[model samples]
Target chain A: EVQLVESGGGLVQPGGSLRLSCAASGFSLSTSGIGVTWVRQAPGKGLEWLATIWWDDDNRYADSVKGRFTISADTSKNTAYLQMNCLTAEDTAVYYCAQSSAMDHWGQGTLVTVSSGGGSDIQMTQSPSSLSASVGDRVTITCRASQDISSYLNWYQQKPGKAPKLLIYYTSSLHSGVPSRFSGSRSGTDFTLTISSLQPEDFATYYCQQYSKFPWTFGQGTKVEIK
Target chain B: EVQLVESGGGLVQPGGSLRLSCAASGFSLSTSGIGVTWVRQAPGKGLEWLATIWWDDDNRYADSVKGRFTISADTSKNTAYLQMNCLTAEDTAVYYCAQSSAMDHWGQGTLVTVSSGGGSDIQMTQSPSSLSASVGDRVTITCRASQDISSYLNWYQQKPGKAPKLLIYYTSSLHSGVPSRFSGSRSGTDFTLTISSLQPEDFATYYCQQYSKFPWTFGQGTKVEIK
Candidate 1:
C-alpha cells in the first residue's frame, strides 16, 4: 500500500537550475533501510539513471550525472529531492523517483523542459522513427546523437503504458534474460538495435541510450508500430 | 556497461517443466561483482521478481517461488538459468534476465505460454477485482492464494503501459519512496494491501506477490478503475 507521487515540472532556461520532489506516504522513511533513486526519460526517448540516496544518507550517481545532479531525502518529511544545475536542452526529460535496487516503487513522472539560450542543443534522434515488420522478419532501428558518445550505447523496448525495459547496453552486449534475436552494435557515432525473426510481441518502441558522457542522453525512440 | 540477453521460452502444459537461459557479455560475469536476476510479466500483466543468483552461487527467491523454482549460474559460460516445474496457465509470461542491484542491464523478454493440463492449478486472485475511489478515500485490496503462502507478501502499483513499481516488500516492509499512506498487513492466511488516502495517480492496478514459497506467484491484479 505504500505510494510515491512526484511533483515539480516546468520550463528551465539554459544554465538555470531545477529541483524536483517525490513525496512518500505509508512507511517510516528513516527506519526502512530502502533507498530512493532518480531516473528520467527524455521526451520520446528512453530512461536514464540519475542518482540514488539511501536511508542512511549515502548517495550514488551515474558517472555522467554525478556533479550537476544531486539527490537527497528528508526522513522526517518522508520526501526525496533531485536538484540539477547548469541545465541545457539536453537536461529536459520526465523525472521519476523510485526505491530499491530494481526500482520497485516509483513516483508519477514530472516533465522538465530546458529551453535554448542562444546556443545549439544537444539532441539525439532515431532513424526511421516508425516502421513495420512481419513475424520472422528482420528489423533494425538506428540511433544517432548530436555528439560523440563512444560505445556507451544501450537499447530498450517500451510498450505503450508500460515502463521501458532494457534491451542491450554498452554497444553490442545483450542484457540478461534478453533473447539473442535482439542485438546491438555500434558504427562510429551511430548505434543500432536489431531484431531477427521478430515475434508477435516484438512490435514496440525501441530506444538507445549513451552513458559515455554527462547528462546521459537517449535517442528519440523508434517505434515498431506493426508486426 | 554489462549486457544481458534472455532466451529459451516456449510452451508448457500443466505440471510440465522448463528451463530458461540468460547470456551475459561486455563485463566478465565470473569476475564482475554483479548478480543476475530473473523477472517475469504475465500476459498483459506487470512484473514479478522470481529469483537472483550471484557470481559465487548464492541465491534467493521470493518465498512463494522457492520450492518449485531454481536459479543457477555458469560463470565459465557467463550464463544464468531459471528452471521451473509444475507449470500451469497462470505461468504464461514474458521472462527477462537482468543484472545489478537496480537491474541496470536487461535482456529483451521471451514469451512462454502454459496451457491447461487438466488438473487443479496453483493460482492467486485479488478480491473485488476492480473498484473505484475518490481522492482522500481509503481502499483495501486482498490477495488469496490457492495454497498457504505464510507471510511472504509484496505489493506493487502499475499504471498502464509502464512497469509495476514495488510498494511493500517482504510482507510489511515499505520500499523506499513509498508513502506511509500505503500499508500492508497479514493474518495467518490472508494478506491485505491498504491505501489510507487514495491519491489521483493511485488509480492504477495493484498486485500482490508472495515470495515466501517456487513460482513466485502474483495475485490476479486488482484495478482501481476510476478515481
Candidate 2:
C-alpha cells in the first residue's frame, strides 16, 4: 500500500532556491534507512531525474545535474526537501517526492515554477518507511508501510501510442527516457516523487506503484496540466 | 541516435498467440555476451516485468507472469520477438521493442491488439542498426551495435511525479515496484523491450539505453496507443 501527503506550491526567483516536502504514513522512515527522491517534468514533455538522498547524508545526482541542488532530511520530522538555486525557465518542472526501496511510493506532486517571488511549501516526510518481505510467497509490501500506502504501488503514465513511462515504480529507480522535469527523494524512511516543470505533453496523469507486495497496486494518478 | 524497426500489427483473442519483432541499427548488438530484453505496459497503467533472453539460449520470467509468454529471436535477422498465449483484455498494452545496455536505442514500436485478426507488416527488417559511443564523453550511445548482438546495457522510463520505472536497466535487474507487464530479453547481444498487451495507459514513449559506454545514451523512444 502507498499513500503520499504532499505540500502545496513553491515560489523561487531565477537562480534562487526552493524546497518541498511530502509526509507519509504506513511506513517507518527511520528504520529502513532508505532515502527520499525527487523527480521533475517539463511542461508538455517527459520525466527527468534530479537526485536521490539517503539517511546517511549521502546524495546521488544524475551526471547531467550539477550546481545549486541539495537534498536534506530531518529524521525527527520524517520529512525531506529539494533545494534548487539559480532557478531558470529550464527548472519549470512539476516536482514530486517519493519513497525508496523496491516498493516505492510517490506523492501527488507540486508545481515548482521559476518566476518572480515564487514561494510555496511542497514538502514530504514519512512516519515508518521500512519494509520487510518474504522470500518466496507473494507478499504485499508497502513503500510508506505506515498508514494507507494503498495496496497498489506500481505507478505509470501513458501518452497515446507512446511507450508507457514509469514514475514511482517499486518506489525508486529513474525510469529511462525520463525528461529533465523529474526527480525523487526519501525522508525518515518515506519515499517521494516530484516533477520539476510540468510540461505540456506532461498533461497526462501520474501514477505510483508497488510490486514488492502481492497483487501489485497503483495510485489513481493526478492529471497534470499547464496553468 | 537509437533506432528500432519493429514488426507491424497482429490480432489475437483470449488464449490466443502472437509474436512481434524489433530490429536495430547504428550500433552493435553484442556486448559483454549479454543479449536483449523485453518489457510491457498496459493501457493507462504502469509497466510490467515480462522476461529476458540471453545469447546462450537462457531466459527468465517474472514470477507473476502467467500462460504462454515466450521470448525468442532470430540473430540472423538481428531481430527479437515476444510471443504470448491466452491473450485477454488485460493483455492490452502498447508493445514496444527496445534494445538493452543502459536501455538505449529503441524501435518505433509494434501495435498488437487482441480484437483484430487482420494484421499489417510494419516490418523494416532491412534498416541499418548500429550504435557507437566513447567511454566518458556522454555520447548519445544508440543500442544498435551490430545486426547480431549489442552490449551489456540498461534503460528506464520516466513518468511525471513518479519514480523512474526500470523497463530495461542494467541489462537485467527488475527494479522493485515494477508490474509484471515489464520484461527483458537478449538475443545474441541484441535487446528488446516489449509490452505483451497494449493497455490504454501503456500509451507512452519507451526508450532503450546503454551502460556499457560512457555518457550513456538513449533511443528516441516509441509511443504506443490503441488503434
Candidate 3:
C-alpha cells in the first residue's frame, strides 16, 4: 500500500522560518512521473494552494506567497519539502503534501502555528497588557514590531457586546466618525495608539495589527478598565 | 486500500454504442464528496479527458464527445458508468475511471477497440478486397455508416514508398492538385470513391472513411493490382 508521512511541524514565531517534509513509501518518487503539491488550510478556513515540486526537479510557487515560500524535492530519499520565510500570524495553518495537485493521494497534515514575541522580524511588543483608568484619564497602548514596519499598521477597538471598530489605520490615518481624540503614530517598529481624553466609551480593548508581513499579525490586546 | 475495477471493454463499431463501468471498493461512494472522472488514451496518443460523475449524481462531459457521451453514478451500488453513443474509430482507446481528474487513484484501464463488420451500424464492405485491372480501367470502393451520414465522408489513396494523401474530403470535395479522375459521393450511409479513368499513378490501395458519426471510421482497404 502507498503512504506519505509528514513531519517538521511545530510552533513558529512571526518573522521566523520553518521547513516541512513529506516522505513517500511504496513507490519510487523519481520514477512516478508526477509532482508533489503542497497545500494549507487555516483552522476552519478554506484550503490554499501553496506550490509543487515535480520529479524533473522543477518547482513552482503560488503567487500568494511567491517570494516567501518555496517547494523542493529529494527523489534520492523519496521526500518532498516546503519552506516558508517571513512568517506572520496569517501564515499559521495546517500544511499538507499531496501526491498530485489534487488531494486524492496525500499525507497526514502537519500543523504549524505562528505566534508573536519570537515571531515577526519586527517583533510586536504590546505594553500594559491591562490597565485601570478613569473616564477622563488619558489612555495609551504601545506596540513594537521589532524591526521597521513603517506605517503599515492598524488599530482596532473592541468593547463587549459590539463588533470591533477601526480607530487608526496606516499608523495615523483616522477613520471618520471615530473619536477625534484617538491618534496613532509610529517610531520604526514602535507604534502608539493613544486616546488623549478618554470617554466612558473608551473603556474597551485595543489591538494593533501589522500588515507589513506576509501573514499580518496583531499584538496582544491592551484593555482599559474603570479604576 | 481503495480500489477501482473497470470493465465493459471490447470491440464496437462506428455508429454503434457501448457502456463502461467502474466499481469502487474500500469506501462508501455516497459519502465520498469527490467525483469519479473518466479519461482515455488512444493506443499511443496523449490522454483525453472524457467526463465525470459527482457524488451528488450530477455529471459533465468533455465537449469533444458531449452530445454522444454521458456519465452517471449509482452510489447504492458503489459503481459509476460511462455511456458512449455513435462510436467511431476515434473512440478506440483505453478508458480509465479515476478517483480524481489527476489520476492519483485510478482503476486498471478498459481497452475498447472499435471494429467494422460487426461494429458500425453502417457496415462498410469494400468490393473485391483485392482486384486486378488495367491502368485505364475505371475503379471504385464502397462504404456505409449503417445510418444516414449525408456527405460526411472522405477517401484516401495509399501507395508503396509514399505517404497517404487525402484524395477527397467531405465525401466529394477534392483537394487542390488531386487528379480529377478521383471523385467521392454518398447515397445515404453508403459512400463511393471512384476513379473514373484510372491512371498508372492510381494503381494502389483505396479506402473510404465516414465522418457522419462520432469517431469517423474507414472501410477495409481495396488493393488495385496490375492485370
* Top lDDT prediction, candidate number: 1
A best-first ranking of the candidates according to their DockQ comes to 1, 2, 3
Candidate 1 deviant stretches above 4 angstroms: A117-227, B1-227
Sorted by lDDT, highest first, which candidate order results? 1, 3, 2
- Candidate 3: global Cα-lDDT? 0.70
lDDT of 3 by residue, B1-227 (tens): 77787789898654567899988888766775777878676674434556766677766554455556778888778888888765555578888787631233467787887655333334456666788889788877776665676776667665643323467878788866888988888775477888888788788877665545433345676888999
All candidates: DockQ: 0.06, 0.02, 0.01
What TM-score do all the candidates reach, one by one? 0.31, 0.37, 0.29
Best-matching candidate per TM-score:
2
Model 3 C-alpha lDDT per residue in residues A163-220, reported as the tens digit of each score: 3456777899887778789999976558898899889878987877665653335566
* Runs off by more than 4 Å, candidate 3: A117-227, B1-227
RMSD of each: 18.5, 29.6, 31.8
The better candidate by DockQ, 1 or 2, is 1
Worst ten in a row by lDDT for model 1 chain B: B114-123
The C-alpha stretches of model 2 lying farther than 4 A from their native spots are A8-11, A63-65, A101-103, A116-227, B1-181, B187-190, B207-221
Which ten residues in a row are the worst by lDDT in model 1 chain A?
A: A115-124
- In order, what fnat does every candidate score? 0.06, 0.02, 0.00
The CAPRI category of model 2 is incorrect
Candidate 3 chain A lDDT trough over 10 residues, lowest sum: A116-125
In model 3, the Cα lDDT at residue A122 comes to 41
Chain B TM-score of candidate number 2: 0.45
